[PDB]
């Protein structure tokens, strides 16, 4: 007749998830690029995207306090739960997730490795130095991320025990930021040359367009293919794997220039910039350390080390495979 309530409400919840994740990814990519353009190398031996993940965890620390259902799911208990896995969809898998650059972290580690085995992998000096720098960069990234998560949880407790200051006071600011993003995405993107005139204006347009699709792909991977095998969510892992191989392939396509003339082909400021925007948005919205950190030492007692090791090693082995 009119409708079907048990279906119309399910559709409304689904479209709410879609809108929230899209808006969160769009608003998080701009923060990522603000941090990246604010690299200002100075010290920070690694620098670049290093801070971004460190940011994404800390803010995520204020969500995991009230996340519960994810925490409960990674605790094999409480039969009458059946709750939404990514509660706070617009913040957990959205701003906190999209900002993370797991694929970019692995790419940075591999690039700083710079072909550890220069001519022979058996030699101690080159191999030891390469493995030392690779371990150092990976340890720095993940230790800083976990520390940021720890300070996030601690500060969440310290601010929660005093006064919540009404949660909806943050809901209103989130909504107004959503309207500002909508207005900007309308006017600035629509009023432009049809060839998407160059400069700083187009440098983010294609990345913004491609980011929410990667975020959606990761969200659906982390909802459908998740919790299929116990103690191994396998959703975030496959998302990160797909992201890192895709980024490696397209970086070889851009940076490698295997025919040699591919750089000459991308001399035109369209072919290289679409790949750059893809690197910015798609693989960056598909690979998340924030969800990775939550699956890490947040919970999943003991066995967490196995998941971390398998993920990191398989990703590195893949990106090595693209080298061949």
């Amino acid at each position, epitope marked *: 007749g009119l409708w*079907n309530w*048990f279906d119309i*409400t*399910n559709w409304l919840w689904y479209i*709410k998830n879609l809108l929230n994740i899209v808006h969160g990814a769009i608003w998080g990519v701009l923060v990522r690029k603000g941090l990246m353009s604010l690299t200002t190398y100075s010290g920070s031996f690694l620098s670049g995207v290093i801070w971004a993940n460190f940011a994404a965890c800390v803010v995520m620390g204020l969500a995991i306090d009230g996340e519960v259902f994810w925490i409960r799911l990674l605790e094999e208990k409480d039969y009458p739960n059946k*709750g*939404a896995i990514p509660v706070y969809t617009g913040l957990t898998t959205g701003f906190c997730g999209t900002v993370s650059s797991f694929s970019s972290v692995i790419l940075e580690a591999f690039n700083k490795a710079a072909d550890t085995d220069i001519g022979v992998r058996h030699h101690y000096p080159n191999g030891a130095y390469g493995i030392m720098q690779f371990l150092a960069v990976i340890l720095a990234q993940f230790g800083l991320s976990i520390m940021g998560f720890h300070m996030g949880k601690q500060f969440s407790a310290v601010v929660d025990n005093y006064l919540p200051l009404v*949660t909806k006071r943050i809901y209103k600011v989130l909504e107004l930021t959503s309207m500002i993003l909508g207005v900007v995405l309308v006017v600035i993107t629509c009023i432009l040359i049809g060839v998407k005139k160059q400069g700083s204006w187009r440098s983010w347009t294609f990345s913004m367009l491609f980011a929410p699709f990667g975020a959606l792909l990761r969200y659906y991977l982390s909802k459908f293919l998740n919790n299929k095998v116990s103690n191994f969510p396998l959703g975030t892992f496959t998302a990160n794997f797909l992201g890192t191989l895709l980024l490696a392939v397209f970086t070889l396509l851009a940076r490698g220039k295997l025919p040699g003339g591919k750089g000459h082909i991308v001399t035109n400021t369209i072919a290289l910039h679409v790949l750059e925007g893809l690197d910015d948005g798609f693989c960056g919205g598909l690979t998340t350390v924030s969800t990775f950190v939550v699956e890490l030492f947040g919970l999943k007692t003991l066995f967490s080390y196995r998941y971390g090791t398998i993920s990191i090693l398989v990703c590195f082995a893949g990106v090595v495979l693209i080298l061949g």
Partner: antibody
Amino acid sequence: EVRLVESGGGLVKPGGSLRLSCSASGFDFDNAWMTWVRQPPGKGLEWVGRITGPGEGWSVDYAESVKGRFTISRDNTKNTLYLEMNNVRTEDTGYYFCARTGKYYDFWSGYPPGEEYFQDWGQGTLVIVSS
Amino acid sequence: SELTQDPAVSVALKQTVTITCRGDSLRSHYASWYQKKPGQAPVLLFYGKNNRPSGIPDRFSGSASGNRASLTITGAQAEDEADYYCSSRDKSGSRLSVFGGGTKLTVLS
């Protein structure tokens, strides 16, 4: 001026049967849900079940202590709500209320299929299942 | 006992007081509230986020946060003495509803 009046009380021997009717008028009845709520005397009231409309084909639901022992069906032509009981246990005693059900689901905060709120209630009927 | 409540609460006249509804399913579902005087039909009081039916005095305000659902009465009058019930989903996303164990409120006369 909406009103719901229950009828069909009286004592019932355990294991017997009883049919409860609810007269309702003054509001759209073919598109509004009905919910049976019972209250044992001196205790807290309990949920029995709800019956839907054309949205799902007049579906049913029941309480975990009631599932399989009660029956809820609706006759839209006569604008009345019917409740059927068989194999009545001693705990079924108390006041039976039939109350119209509202539907509520915020579009931004919530989880399907949302909450249910009763925009009105009825005077009530008394059943005493005593041996 | 899916929903738990305070069995009885006391408050003097013109002084505010709160009625606390605690449950697991309230995290992903809002609550409802029903004034119940003895021998009378319960009347809907407060439901959802900020929805209140027309006619009821403004003194009944409810808030939802965490795993608690709170209906706070401001200035309980002489006729406000009754039992108040909270109802919502039993399982977090199931096609059912349940009710609390009882909350008797007594205005100190």
